[PDB]
Design a protein around this nucleic acid. Sequence first.
RNA 1: GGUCAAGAUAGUAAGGGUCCACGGUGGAUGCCCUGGCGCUGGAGCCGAUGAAGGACGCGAUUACCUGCGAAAAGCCCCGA
Length: 66
Amino acid sequence: MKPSEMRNLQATDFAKEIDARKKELMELRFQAAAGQLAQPHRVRQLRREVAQLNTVKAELARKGEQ
RNA sequence: GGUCAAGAUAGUAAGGGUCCACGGUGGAUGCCCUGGCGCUGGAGCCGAUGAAGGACGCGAUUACCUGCGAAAAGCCCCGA
């Protein structure tokens, strides 16, 4: 979600943990359209996770490569 | 008290007029400030690392404005 237990993971695991949220994030949209969206907060939260993910896989890209 | 004659004069308001009471309309006037103007001083360039200014988006619900930019009313770090 936010600490060093997130960045510690592999490169193809970062791409994997991005799309895992997106699969849910799309299912939430399909639920929203139907009228079974009792947890709207989950949508805001999942999108936040993808942001942090992409932010980090750009912090570690610049570090080492100088 | 009565009939006849001779005179004179009142009241009626379909509608109008002046004044008064009460209203409707309208937004003057007074009070206000959420907005402006001037002068004084500060500060004074932005852009191929892509501007000024825009299009289309981003919301559980989003027409308008705001903020943003598929990492989308926000993501990370430092400080208060």
